[PDB]
Every structure is written in C-alpha cells, then in structure tokens.
Amino acid sequence: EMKTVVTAAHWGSIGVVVQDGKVVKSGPAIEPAVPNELQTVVADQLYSEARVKCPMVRKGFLANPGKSDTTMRGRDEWVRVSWDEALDLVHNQLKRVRDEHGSTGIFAGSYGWFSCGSLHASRTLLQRYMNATGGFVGHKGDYSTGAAQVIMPHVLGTIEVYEQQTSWESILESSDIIVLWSANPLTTMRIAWMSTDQKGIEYFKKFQASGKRIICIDPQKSETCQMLNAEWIPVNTATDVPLMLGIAHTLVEQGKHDKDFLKKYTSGYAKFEEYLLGKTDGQPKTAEWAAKICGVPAETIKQLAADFASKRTMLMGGWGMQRQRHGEQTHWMLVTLASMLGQIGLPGGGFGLSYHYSNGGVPTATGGIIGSITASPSLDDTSKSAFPLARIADVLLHPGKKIQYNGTEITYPDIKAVYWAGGNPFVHHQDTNTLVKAFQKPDVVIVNEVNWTPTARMADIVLPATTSYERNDLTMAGDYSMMSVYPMKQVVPPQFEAKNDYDIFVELAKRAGVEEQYTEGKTEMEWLEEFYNAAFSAARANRVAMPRFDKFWAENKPLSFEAGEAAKKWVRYGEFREDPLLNPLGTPSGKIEIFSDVVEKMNYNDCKGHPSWMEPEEFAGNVTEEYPLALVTPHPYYRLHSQLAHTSLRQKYAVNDREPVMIHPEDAAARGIKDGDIVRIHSKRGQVLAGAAVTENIIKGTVALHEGAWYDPMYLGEKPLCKNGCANVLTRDEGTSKLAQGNSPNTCIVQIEKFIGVAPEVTVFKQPKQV
Numbered sequence: 001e002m003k004t005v006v007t008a009a010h011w012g013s014i015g016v017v018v019q020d021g022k023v024v025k026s027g028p029a030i031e032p033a034v035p036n037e038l039q040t041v042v043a044d045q046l047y048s049e050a051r052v053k054c055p056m057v058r059k060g061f062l063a064n065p066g067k068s069d070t071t072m073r074g075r076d077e078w079v080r081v082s083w084d085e086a087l088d089l090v091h092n093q094l095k096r097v098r099d100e101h102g103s104t105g106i107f108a109g110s111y112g113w114f115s116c117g118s119l120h121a122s123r124t125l126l127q128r129y130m131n132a133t134g135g136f137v138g139h140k141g142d143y144s145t146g147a148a149q150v151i152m153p154h155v156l157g158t159i160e161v162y163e164q165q166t167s168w169e170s171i172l173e174s175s176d177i178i179v180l181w182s183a184n185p186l187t188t189m190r191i192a193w194m195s196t197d198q199k200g201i202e203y204f205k206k207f208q209a210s211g212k213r214i215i216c217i218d219p220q221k222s223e224t225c226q227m228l229n230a231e232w233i234p235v236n237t238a239t240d241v242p243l244m245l246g247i248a249h250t251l252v253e254q255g256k257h258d259k260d261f262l263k264k265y266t267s268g269y270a271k272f273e274e275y276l277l278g279k280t281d282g283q284p285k286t287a288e289w290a291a292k293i294c295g296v297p298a299e300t301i302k303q304l305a306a307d308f309a310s311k312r313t314m315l316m317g318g319w320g321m322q323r324q325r326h327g328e329q330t331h332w333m334l335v336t337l338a339s340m341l342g343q344i345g346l347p348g349g350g351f352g353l354s355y356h357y358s359n360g361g362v363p364t365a366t367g368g369i370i371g372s373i374t375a376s377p378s379l380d381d382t383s384k385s386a387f388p389l390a391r392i393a394d395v396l397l398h399p400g401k402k403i404q405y406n407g408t409e410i411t412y413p414d415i416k417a418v419y420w421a422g423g424n425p426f427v428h429h430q431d432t433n434t435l436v437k438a439f440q441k442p443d444v445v446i447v448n449e450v451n452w453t454p455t456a457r458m459a460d461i462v463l464p465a466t467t468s469y470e471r472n473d474l475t476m477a478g479d480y481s482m483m484s485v486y487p488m489k490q491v492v493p494p495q496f497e498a499k500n501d502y503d504i505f506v507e508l509a510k511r512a513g514v515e516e517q518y519t520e521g522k523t524e525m526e527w528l529e530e531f532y533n534a535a536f537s538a539a540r541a542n543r544v545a546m547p548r549f550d551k552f553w554a555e556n557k558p559l560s561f562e563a564g565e566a567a568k569k570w571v572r573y574g575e576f577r578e579d580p581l582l583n584p585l586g587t588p589s590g591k592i593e594i595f596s597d598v599v600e601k602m603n604y605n606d607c608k609g610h611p612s613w614m615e616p617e618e619f620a621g622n623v624t625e626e627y628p629l630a631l632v633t634p635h636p637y638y639r640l641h642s643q644l645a646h647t648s649l650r651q652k653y654a655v656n657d658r659e660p661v662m663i664h665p666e667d668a669a670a671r672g673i674k675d676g677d678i679v680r681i682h683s684k685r686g687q688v689l690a691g692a693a694v695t696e697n698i699i700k701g702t703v704a705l706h707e708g709a710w711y712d713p714m715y716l717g718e719k720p721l722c723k724n725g726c727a728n729v730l731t732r733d734e735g736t737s738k739l740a741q742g743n744s745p746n747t748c749i750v751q752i753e754k755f756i757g758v759a760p761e762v763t764v765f766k767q768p769k770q771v
C-alpha cells in the first residue's frame with residue numbers, strides 16, 4: 001500500500017515513495033551536504049501533461065510522407081496513430097533514404113543528455129539500431145568543451161577536461177587559495193553524466209569550513225560565490241584572456257614567475273613572453289591595459305598576481321568561458337598562467353578543468369565499474385562525413401560546403417533524415433530562428449521524446465518514450481569516484497502509450513530483420529546482470545567482494561566502495577613534475593606547449609601559435625547604441641538544461657511566468673524596469689520575453705539569461721517572439737575558430753526594454769494542437 005523504491009538520475013540516487021500505485025514523493029537515498037531540489041519531482045516527471053501520451057504524426061506529413069511542405073514543421077496539426085502505423089512509417093521513411101542515398105543521408109548524432117542508465121541509453125540505442133541497419137552520420141565533439149577538448153591535446157597531450165583531478169583531500173590539506181574561474185560548482189555538480197555521488201559539493205563546503213580563500217571570477221555573483229561566502233571578482237564575459245595576460249605581465253614585471261619551472265616543463269614560453277611584453281605588437285599586456293578590457297581594477301589584477309605566486313593556488317577553470325568565440329584561448333592561457341606560477345604537479349597546486357563537473361577530484365574508489373550497452377551490434381563510409389556538432393544548422397542548409405577544422409577539411413554531407421532520441425536541439429543549439437529554417441530541409445524528422453519539447457514540436461513523427469522510473473536499469477555514482485553501484489528499480493508501469501526506447505528500436509529492428517543482433521537474445525534483466533557482472537569481475541581482480549546480482553537487485557540499495565591512500569593522495573601531473581624526461585606528456589615536445597608549432601603551422605586567422613587576445617564580434621567591449629548590453633547564458637540551478645522545466649520547480653525561479661533575466665539596477669533604472677517586470681530581450685538574431693530580476697549580483701552592462709528554457713514561439717505573421725525566454729533565440733551560431741569549431745553562445749550583445757501590453761500565455765508545457 002505504501003513502499004519506497006530506490007532508483008537514480010543524473011542528479012543522484014533517489015528514494016521514491018509509492019502510495020497505492022502512485023508516486024507521491026521523491027528525495028535523496030543518500031543525504032547530501034546541500035539539498036538537491038532536482039531529486040524531488042519524480043511525480044511531476046511521471047504524470048505531467050507535457051508528456052507525449054501517444055505516437056503522433058504531422059498532418060501534412062501524413063498527406064505526403066517524405067514529400068511534404070516542410071515549412072509546416074512547428075506549425076501543423078498533430079494526428080494520433082497506432083504504434084503499428086508509426087513504426088511502419090518510420091521504417092519505410094528511413095528505408096527510402098537508405099535506398100536512394102545510403103547511410104550518409106541519415107543524421108543520428110542525436111546529441112543530448114537523456115537519462116542515466118547502462119541499458120536504457122536512448123541515444124546509444126538509436127545509434128545501435130542505425131548501425132545494425134547500415135550506419136549513419138554522427139558528429140564530433142560536444143557542446144560542453146567544444147573548444148577546450150581540441151586545444152588541450154595540443155597543449156597537454158590529453159583531453160584533460162574529462163579526467164580525474166588532483167585529490168580533493170590534497171586540496172583540503174595543501175591549497176591556500178582555490179580560484180573558481182568561470183566555474184559555478186554548487187550549481188553544476190548537482191548532476192553527473194552517470195549519477196552524482198554528491199561528494200564534490202561536500203568538499204567545497206569542507207574547504208569553505210577551513211576558512212581558506214575561495215575566489216570566484218565570473219560576470220555574475222553565482223550561486224556558488226554566495227553559498228561558499230567567497231570573494232567575488234566581477235569580470236566582463238569573454239575578457240578572461242586579457243585578465244590572465246595582465247596577471248601574467250605583473251608576474252614577469254615583479255620577477256615572480258617560476259623561470260625554473262618554465263625552463264624544465266614547458267616549450268615555447270620565450271615566444272609567448274615577446275607577445276606578453278609587447279615586443280611583437282608594441283603593446284605590453286599590463287594590468288592597466290587589461291583593466292580597461294575586463295573591468296577588474298589594475299591594482300586588483302596586481303594583487304591577484306602576488307597572491308597566486310606566494311600561496312599554494314589551485315586554478316579551477318569552468319567551461320562557460322570557452323563556450324564563446326575564440327574559446328580555445330581561455331584554457332590555453334589558463335594553463336600558461338599556471339605554468340608561470342610553477343605549482344603544477346604539487347599537492348593542492350596548479351590547475352584543474354573538472355573540479356566543477358561531475359565531482360572531479362573525489363578520490364577514485366577501488367572496486368568495479370558496470371558495463372553498458374554499445375552502439376556496436378554483432379559500404380558505410382560515414383566517418384568522413386562527421387562534423388563538429390554545432391555546425392548542424394550549417395550542414396542542413398549547405399550540403400557539400402567545406403570547412404576547416406583542427407588542421408583538416410570537412411565536407412558537409414547531404415542529410416535527408418534526422419532522428420533525435422534524447423536531446424533538445426531547439427533549446428540547446430544557437431540561433432533558434434536559423435535552426436528552424438535548417439529543419440525545413442530534411443525529408444523526414446523523427447523524435448523519441450518523453451515530453452512535448454520544442455524539438456518534438458518541430459518533428460514529423462513523435463514517438464512517446466518512458467522515463468527511467470518506468471523501467472529497470474543500473475548506473476554508477478560518479479563521474480570519477482566510481483564509489484557506488486546504484487540500482488534503478490522500476491517504480492511504476494509505463495504511462496499512457498509510452499515505450500522504452502529499447503522497445504521502440506527492437507520493433508524497428510524487427511522490421512529491418514536485425515532483431516537478434518540488436519537484442520543479442522537478452523531480456524532487460526539479463527542485460528543488467530551482464531553489465532553488473534562486469535563490475536563483479538573487476539572488483540574481484542581488485543580484491544573487492546561484491547554480492548551476486550540477484551542478491552544486489554533484491555536489496556535495492558546502493559552498493560559502495562572505498563578509496564585507498566594512493567587515490568586520496570593522488571596529484572595530477574605529479575609524475576610529470578617528478579621527472580618530465582621519464583614521464584613526458586603526449587605532446588610533440590613532451591612538455592607543456594605554451595607555443596604550439598602544430599597550431600601555428602595551421603595558419604588560422606582566428607588561432608595563433610600561442611595564447612592571444614582576439615576581440616570577438618560581440619562582447620561588453622564593443623556593445624553598440626542599438627545593442628548596449630552584453631549577454632551570458634549560464635547553466636540553471638533548478639533544471640538540467642531543459643529537463644524538469646515542466647515541473648513544479650519552475651515556481652522556484654519563474655518571474656511573471658517567464659525565464660528570469662538578471663539585470664543590474666542601474667541598467668534597469670535607465671529603462672524604467674522594476675523587479676518583476678516582463679521585459680523584451682532582442683539581438684540581431686531574435687527576441688524573447690523574460691522576467692526582470694534586478695540585482696547587483698551581475699556586473700553592470702551585462703545581463704544573464706540561463707540556458708534551457710523551452711522555446712515557445714508566438715506566431716503573429718519573421719523571427720517570432722519566444723514567450724518563455726529561451727536564451728539561444730538570441731545567440732550567434734558560429735564556430736569558436738577554425739581550430740575547434742565549437743559553439744560560441746557567450747559572446748553576445750542585446751538590448752532590453754520594458755514590455756508594454758498583456759503578457760502572452762506560455763503554452764509550451766501543454767499538449768499540442770489536435771492531440
């Protein structure tokens with residue numbers, strides 16, 4: 001009559017209370033250091049009226065499958081169909097593309113975060129089906145570190161951003177200063193790719209409790225800065241390279257840089273110093289020069305230099321500052337600065353590029369790691385067609401176009417079919433109006449979705465998918481500690497006519513005659529036992545005993561491992577520092593590449609051989625009369641991107657039923673805007689409505705609109721107005737540079753005005769037309 005079921009999500013292990021077959025409460029299965037409200041809305045996710053309840057097809061698509069008026073996408077009426085008919089239609093439409101163009105005509109990169117779980121990984125299951133039927137065009141990189149993950153291999157010989165960090169125990173014991181540079185961990189570590197072990201936030205609180213210095217360098221006084229009682233250094237968005245250069249110049253000018261470290265562990269510093277001192281362009285990159293650009297007073301720049309060089313300092317760089325034009329320069333320069341400080345490889349010293357993401361630094365436990373489903377079941381030349389994924393709109397609009405990327409050339413393919421399963425590009429991709437046009441080009445657009453997202457509303461065929469709570473699965477506490485195996489026990493039966501993505505793709509696999517290769521003859525629970533036994537065997541090899549799967553599953557509790565002393569004491573780059581000749585980096589020199597011949601020899605206009613300041617098209621430094629404010633689009637506290645936007649958590653932040661925009665009181669007063677007013681934000685790309693949140697917690701001249709609000713266009717006969725405040729309606733869709741071609745949202749300027757009139761009803765969380 002009343003039971004508690006343990007399952008999990010990106011936002012942690014979750015206990016779910018079921019009362020007479022209905023979910024009535026959800027919360028942490030393991031008490032966290034800071035409450036995580038994301039864990040409390042399982043019932044909202046299960047029973048929401050925004051859920052896709054039945055297979056649906058666009059009316060105009062039904063009239064002429066694969067030959068419709070595609071300008072009707074997003075505008076049409078929806079027809080309920082049976083699963084039989086929808087699956088026959090999907091199979092037929094994909095087969096037509098394969099028959100006429102082959103695998104290069106299908107895009108199934110399907111970027112998204114979907115839900116955690118080893119088996120029910122909607123994106124992987126889609127790609128497993130696509131590969132079982134001949135292949136598909138995928139993508140390269142990701143939206144999180146599109147720039148940093150390309151430049152760091154050139155500088156450090158490794159991807160760096162998704163690797164274990166120096167142990168938090170070492171930071172607690174030895175760091176005098178931690179600098180949160182474009183990092184908001186008390187927001188961004190409420191989730192992990194698997195399931196957050198919740199220990200990263202705890203360690204930040206332990207460091208706060210030590211009383212040692214925490215510095216936040218950010219255009220906003222973030223949730224982290226406020227909750228950790230930290231020192232706020234306001235900085236203009238996209239001006240961190242000038243600030244780092246000013247700090248670097250001060251170090252040289254005062255003889256505080258570590259010349260011994262630079263000599264032994266880096267390559268090309270001299271070429272960089274010539275630029276730093278103004279010997280190549282005639283402009284020394286002084287603190288006074290930097291202050292004009294980044295808004296940090298020159299004397300504050302100098303004191304940071306002195307404090308960093310005299311105290312054991314860990315530079316924790318987040319990723320907002322590389323999600324922008326020339327983003328490659330920021331973490332390149334951060335590494336360069338850390339090299340000049342000379343503390344890389346010391347306890348509590350150096351830099352880290354994942355202390356803000358998925359609990360980096362939490363000591364790695366000794367245990368086992370479960371398996372998971374792959375896209376490889378057991379003529380396809382799509383590898384050459386993969387492109388940097390943020391070029392998606394460019395690809396759909398310009399088939400055959402060639403671009404430069406990381407020293408090579410890529411030719412866009414000719415995409416006829418788009419299948420998304422577990423992502424929301426009409427919220428996550430930049431310049432939404434251009435994406436609308438791009439999605440008119442494919443012959444067929446298919447979406448598996450839990451809810452009626454803006455992406456589903458732009459499709460031809462929408463298939464209802466289940467949540468994690470309607471199926472069984474396994475995940476880990478992570479993403480680096482690997483300290484627990486979390487069970488994901490089914491809480492309720494599938495709702496409405498929703499199906500697990502697994503079952504959707506089994507049915508399509510049957511229609512193509514590849515069911516056996518897809519399922520491998522296994523049931524849901526047989527898949528999970530196999531994944532579990534992979535961890536069982538690895539734990540055994542590590543001298544750790546685990547219960548049998550059936551015992552583990554019956555207990556329905558997290559199974560946790562312990563970290564040993566080696567993990568608790570581990571220092572990143574410690575071996576390199578001990579002996580760089582015997583422990584070289586995977587770079588051409590074997591050292592830190594402050595100057596990279598490889599990058600220089602590419603001869604790109606927007607990326608030189610060493611870190612440099614290159615003014616972007618739009619930022620605080622070149623706002624105009626027409627667009628006098630700069631924009632930054634940080635990640636939200638009460639959503640995972642667009643996930644949970646439809647839940648009761650919306651009431652915790654919506655202002656006048658719009659996404660809130662942080663605006664400085666001086667910029668608000670100049671516009672007659674008071675707290676709580678609906679405002680109109682517009683750029684050269686589009687216009688959205690938001691709710692004014694007037695606050696000194698944002699640097700003057702800049703406004704912050706969090707990413708992830710559901711695009712809700714108001715069609716009034718054109719770049720229609722978003723009624724809800726989707727940030728990417730406003731952003732530029734362009735590569736960071738020819739090196740990485742990452743996405744560049746956070747270099748943007750806008751205008752804001754008080755909205756006069758009656759506020760449009762927000763309709764994007766309700767069933768669409770003709771359900």
Ligand SMILES: Nc1nc2c(c(=O)[nH]1)N[C@H]1C(S)=C(S)[C@@H](COP(=O)(O)OP(=O)(O)OC[C@H]3O[C@@H](n4cnc5c(=O)[nH]c(N)nc54)[C@H](O)[C@@H]3O)O[C@H]1N2
Binds near residue numbers: 122424641727
């Ligand atoms: N202006 C700006 N834009 C940005 C960013 C920014 O910082 N500023 N950040 C970028 C980055 S780092 C990210 S990773 C992206 C996020 O981009 P997305 O990953 O697309 O955002 P999500 O809201 O997580 O979308 C996940 C979708 O998967 C669905 N889903 C969940 N579980 C399942 C399932 O089991 N089956 C199926 N079929 N669907 C499921 C959810 O309903 C949800 O719609 O945004 C990027 N865009």
Ligand SMILES: Nc1nc2c(c(=O)[nH]1)N[C@H]1C(S)=C(S)[C@@H](COP(=O)(O)OP(=O)(O)OC[C@H]3O[C@@H](n4cnc5c(=O)[nH]c(N)nc54)[C@H](O)[C@@H]3O)O[C@H]1N2
Binds near residue numbers: 237
């Ligand atoms: N609750 C929640 N947690 C999450 C996510 C979520 O959507 N919701 N997204 C997850 C995923 S997919 C990702 S990739 C990571 C994102 O990890 P991050 O990229 O670090 O998340 P952002 O909010 O974009 O972090 C940028 C922070 O630095 C600021 N900032 C932005 N641009 C600049 C700049 O140019 N210079 C300086 N000095 N500061 C800048 C932002 O205001 C913001 O406070 O977080 C993950 N964790």
Ligand SMILES: [Mo]
Binds near residue numbers: 143144
């Ligand atoms: Mo991300």
Ligand SMILES: [O]
Binds near residue numbers: 142143144145
């Ligand atoms: O990501």
